[PDB]
Design a protein around this ligand. Structure first.
Ligand code: HEM
Ligand SMILES: CC(C)Cc1c(-c2ccccc2)ncn1CCCn1ccnc1
Length: 214
């Protein structure tokens, strides 16, 4: 396509279906998710957003990222901190898991942010835009399966408080992505990096499924 935002969505549709088809996500969508499983997703997201937001901050003034720098609207670390205190309790920093598949994702995020910052947008796309389109329904499934007490915490990750409308913010984000100027080579690399991002998630999903089924 012309617009990078369209080119990304089109080019990742297949891997996106793979992610939807992953065994752990299938169980999820079918409402079969356990607290143990959900804890692992929350832990994974924490390590992922820590590293991504670290690298966004390192690159916030770079011409290859600045147009999609939206820290107040999108930042997820503090929400995940809140959520992990609930899921893992007061000592969550000492007890949350940090698995090999989580590390592999984090390592690629840091590699991209430090040495290939022009691809960071692929990672921010894969995560943030995903989160905006999807939080709604998967959250509801979670609440049903998990049957939380009404303790007012645990799911802050799924609310972006600084975005009034996800639809309008997603159009704005697409617009800014489409304003990035890149050579055809960089653009091919950005697309490929998004596929890589999806694969990192899929591999993580494969690992969590393994860890939970012994
Ligand atoms: C690894 C997990 C996933 C990632 C990284 C991911 C990522 C994304 C991304 C980046 C988008 C934005 C597409 C665009 O507008 O350009 C998106 C949209 C979407 N995702 Fe996901 N997703 C994942 C899992 C799922 C699952 C499990 C479902 C449903 C069960 C789902 C349903 C959707 C839907 C319905 C859209 C919106 C389609 C549209 O408006 O055009 N995704 N996802
Ligand atoms: C339950 C949910 C958080 C699963 C998920 C992950 C995930 C990744 C890595 C580890 C754990 C979970 N990434 C995206 N999702 C779907 C929610 C966002 N979305 C995207 C498109 N439609 C919705």
């Amino acid at each position: 396509p012309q617009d990078l935002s369209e080119a990304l969505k089109e080019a990742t549709k297949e891997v996106h279906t793979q992610a939807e088809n992953a065994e752990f996500m299938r169980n999820f969508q079918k409402g079969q998710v356990t607290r143990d499983g959900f804890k692992l997703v929350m832990a994974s997201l924490y390590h992922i957003y820590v590293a991504l937001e670290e690298e966004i901050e390192r690159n916030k003034e770079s011409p290859v990222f600045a147009p999609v720098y939206f820290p107040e609207e999108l930042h997820r670390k503090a929400a995940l901190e809140q959520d992990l205190a609930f899921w893992y309790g007061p000592r969550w920093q000492e007890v949350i898991p940090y698995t090999p598949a989580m590390q592999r994702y984090v390592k690629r995020l840091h590699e991209v942010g430090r040495t290939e910052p022009e691809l960071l947008v692929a990672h921010a796309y894969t995560r943030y835009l995903g989160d905006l389109s999807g939080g709604q329904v998967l959250k509801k499934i979670a609440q049903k399966a998990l049957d939380l007490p009404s303790s007012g915490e645990g799911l802050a990750f799924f609310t972006f408080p600084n975005i009034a409308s996800a639809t309008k913010f997603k159009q704005l984000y697409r617009s800014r992505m489409n304003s990035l100027e890149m050579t055809p080579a960089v653009r091919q690399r950005v697309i490929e990096e998004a596929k890589t991002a999806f694969l990192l998630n899929i591999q993580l999903f494969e690992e969590l499924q393994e860890l939970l089924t012994h």
